[model samples]
Target: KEVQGVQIKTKEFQRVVGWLSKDSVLLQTKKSGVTYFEELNIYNEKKRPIFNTKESISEVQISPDYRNILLYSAESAEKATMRIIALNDGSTVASRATKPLTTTFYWNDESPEKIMFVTYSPEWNFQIENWDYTLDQLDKIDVASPFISWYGDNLVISNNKDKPDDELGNLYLQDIRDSATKNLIVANIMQFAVHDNVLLTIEKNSDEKLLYDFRTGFQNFFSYNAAREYDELGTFVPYFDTNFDKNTFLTFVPYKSAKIGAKEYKLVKIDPTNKKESTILELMDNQPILSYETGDLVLYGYLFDKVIDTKTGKMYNLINTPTKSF
Candidate 1:
């Protein structure tokens, strides 16, 4: 409907990661070699210091229960070495060093105590590691690409070691308990979203289309270009609705004009069951999409502006200031 109550203000930083807890918003700021972790009370919208210790934090991941924060750090001089920090009291829970992690470390959806990470290697072979509180390594699977998606304890990974030179890649699903990985799809896919057993992905083929449930052994849903056919096409940025009762997805298609440099974006909502599609909004040149859906209320975030109460078609802008470079 409308983003009426929330507000945010920040200083110059190269990048910022925003995490939402039940009662507050945690803003992790990254600038140069320093990282500042701050928490803002959502109800009052006031900032408070969480942690400002010295360390080159590359990634910060909050636990599912919002009780613990996981951080990955590397020294400015020793870039090859990385350290993992588990913070519960805004200090430190535990820290460890391992091979450099190429992809973001993921926490198991079903078991929050477990953490998973993938390390890049030569010969195109990658290593996936799972670790728990015991500091015991649970599982390590070597695959091709570093891209991964987690559904409970199962992982959907891209396996392209068979065709290293080929731009297109095949996807596989591997259960943490099982050693074997099942082949799911054979296509050039970018990002993916999974719910229940349905998988949604964006294909890099002719239309730059969107495909759903490609691993179900049956073609389920497909959306292609509705306008003129051309070589250059818009990209589909997809995100999943984890709070929905059924499988629901949100995606944005940003169209670029051939002649001019003009660009526009259209947000779409897709329902996997009835294959029903609804246009959420039409805007201009937005890359990432952030949305929060619960029960009947949906909050959609555009580039810098956010639209709340999206499901009822009643939307309100949260921030509209022209974004300046960091």
Candidate 2:
């Protein structure tokens, strides 16, 4: 079920706007601003162009169920504010007079009807907005941390207003119905990980290694450095293993540079129960791991490759050639 490159349309450089299915239906935006959008059918043997829009489309998102597509026009060069559209019928969902933050819009995993976005006001305060087609006034909340997640009926947010510089932040659970929130864990001291009733977290500054279960009150489970007999392979950004069930997770060693050398990084998987861990990959070739996450598949983004799936160990190259001058 892999899709190889099938030529349908030709362009000097093409940007994939969104993927409707895992790899079949793809929405793409062109480098030419005037030639906005093109819907591609990669699954088709011929790899034909199914449809295209005339407007200058910039940002795009396909619904979770693959029933709808959302398109946004670039309000400005830098700020790509979007206007939402229902892909199934090509109907307008919402059109805002003002531009959005551009980078923070995401679909709610639990409920597809809802969408969430983060925006900063004129005062520079961060605000979260939950838009539901069924609601009248959009649901809004104030939060500090840039990360957010929606569980069954609650929204998990990193609540670290006071300690902006600290890597360890607090995780707050807010009820979606009433918006009443409770501090699930104070001084998280590491990162927040949520899976069903199990809330996984870690304490970096302390002796405790591996992810701790907050739902059951900080149960010590795994210890990577202790079990694997490896030194703290360097500081890891809280990386989650999305390819496996939410129950499983891992931390990724970030790429760092010394006073006079190139950067390096490593990948490690941590067990939630026994605290056991293992190193998956190590690199010191100057390339760095930029971002990563776990879902139905483990995906990592690097400086050179846009997306890499850990499940099959596949890398998708998205580099563009620099324009030449006559």
Of the candidates shown, which would achieve the greatest TM-score relative to the real structure?
1
Report the lDDT tens digits of candidate 1 across residue range 1-326.
12344433344332324344533445555455456777644345566666664665566766655666777766544453333334434765556665444656776656666787776657555677777744645676544456665666555455454455543466676666664655666455655555445555545544434344423342555444322113333443334344332345565554542211223566667665656777766763334444432333343442324443446656654433335534
Q: Which parts of model 1 have CA positions greater than 4 angstroms off?
A: 1-16, 30-34, 79-88, 99-101, 121-125, 133-135, 154-156, 176-191, 195-197, 204-208, 213-245, 254-263, 293-309, 312-326
lDDT of each: 0.52, 0.48
Question: Per-candidate RMSD vs. true structure?
Answer: 5.1, 6.2
TM-score between model 1 and native:
0.70
What is candidate 1's CA lDDT for residue 282? 70
lDDT of 2: 0.48
Q: What is the number of backbone collisions in each predicted candidate, taken in the order shown?
A: 4, 10
